[PDB]
Amino acid sequence: ARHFVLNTGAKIPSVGLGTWQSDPGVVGDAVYTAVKAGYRHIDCAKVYGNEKEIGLALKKLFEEGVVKREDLFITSKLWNDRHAPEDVPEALNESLTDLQLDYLDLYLIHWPFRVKKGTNTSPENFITPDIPATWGAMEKCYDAGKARAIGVSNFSSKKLGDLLAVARVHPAVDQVECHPGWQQTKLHNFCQSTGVHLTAYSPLGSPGTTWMNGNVLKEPVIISIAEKLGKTPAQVALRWNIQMGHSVLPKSTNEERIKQNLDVYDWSIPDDLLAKFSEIKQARLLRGNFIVNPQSVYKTHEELWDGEL
Numbered sequence: 001a002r003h004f005v006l007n008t009g010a011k012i013p014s015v016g017l018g019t020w021q022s023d024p025g026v027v028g029d030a031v032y033t034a035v036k037a038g039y040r041h042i043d044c045a046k047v048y049g050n051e052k053e054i055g056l057a058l059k060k061l062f063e064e065g066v067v068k069r070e071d072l073f074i075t076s077k078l079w080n081d082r083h084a085p086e087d088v089p090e091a092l093n094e095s096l097t098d099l100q101l102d103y104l105d106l107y108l109i110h111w112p113f114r115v116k117k118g119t120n121t122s123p124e125n126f127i128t129p130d131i132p133a134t135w136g137a138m139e140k141c142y143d144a145g146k147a148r149a150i151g152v153s154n155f156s157s158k159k160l161g162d163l164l165a166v167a168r169v170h171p172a173v174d175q176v177e178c179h180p181g182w183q184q185t186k187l188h189n190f191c192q193s194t195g196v197h198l199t200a201y202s203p204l205g206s207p208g209t210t211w212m213n214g215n216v217l218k219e220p221v222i223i224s225i226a227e228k229l230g231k232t233p234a235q236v237a238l239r240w241n242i243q244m245g246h247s248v249l250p251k252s253t254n255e256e257r258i259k260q261n262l263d264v265y266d267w268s269i270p271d272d273l274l275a276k277f278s279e280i281k282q283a284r285l286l287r288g289n290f291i292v293n294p295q296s297v298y299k300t301h302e303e304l305w306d307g308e309l
């Protein structure tokens, strides 16, 4: 249960450390602790700013012989201001430099949304996306060896299919919000039919993000399953995703919960309990408001998510 296989043949560890919202000093400690506890998968993103810090933790892990580089699966993400084809490999090079790596295992287009290089998400910065042109540049970084796999994040079934249709190198991953409160069944089936792996971000419902209002680990179905199996709600939530065949990116800074989030491998949710997940109310928590706008290509949330909301 410990790995899934991407359409490139490479194995992605089923659990990775999320690092969204990890401040100065804290993220390196979490990455260090997660890897010694046994994590082999670290999910990063340039837009979080903390890649230099992550790189220093990885450098310490390598030097202490905790792991070798080829033991680790490192992901980073191309931010919305580097979609232009000429900017794509430069952005990757900057993420590589900050992380002190020669290659990423996975490079993702962060959002199907573009702004002018070096500007912020404001309506006077909006450029109409050209995913095919951007993907072409992602493909060259893959061909050059800088990214062992390339993929996307926050892509609907439609948009993922529109990219598969034009692509030479298939996206290896679609990383999306996915948890018992937002189970992504449509996208799940579509990935299965296309060979795209689905990585679950916010696999716990991001309890610690104020503006999302996530109380997923509080659904009675999860609590009930948690005590009949003798596991935390988190473990049950994570295990649910793994049993759906998805990798999960639990984010945490507490050492004990980091270890608990890895203990989702050698037990199962029985069939009769798993059926109960169809009873959980479904609501998308990361709605994408910041790119829904009268001047954006997505004027409604439906246009961003193509109905899956």
Ligand SMILES: NC(=O)c1ccc[n+]([C@@H]2O[C@H](COP(=O)([O-])OP(=O)(O)OC[C@H]3O[C@@H](n4cnc5c(N)ncnc54)[C@H](OP(=O)(O)O)[C@@H]3O)[C@@H](O)[C@H]2O)c1
Pocket (backbone or CB within 6 Å): 017, 018, 019, 020, 021, 043, 044, 110, 153, 154, 175, 176, 200, 201, 202, 203, 204, 205, 206, 207, 208, 209, 217, 232, 234, 235, 249, 250, 251, 252, 253, 254, 257, 258, 260, 261, 286
């Ligand atoms: N591609 C994208 O656009 C995108 C968007 C969002 C996230 N992501 C990626 O996916 C990762 C995960 O999503 P997320 O950070 O939004 O939220 P999440 O992992 O679902 O939940 C994080 C929150 O849950 C708490 N928590 C962690 N382990 C727990 C446990 N065992 N029991 C109870 N509570 C626990 C954490 O606090 P403690 O630190 O105290 O444990 C933290 O406040 C991110 O870190 C990021 O790498 C990607």
Ligand SMILES: [Co+2]
Pocket (backbone or CB within 6 Å): 164, 167, 168, 170
């Ligand atoms: Co093809």
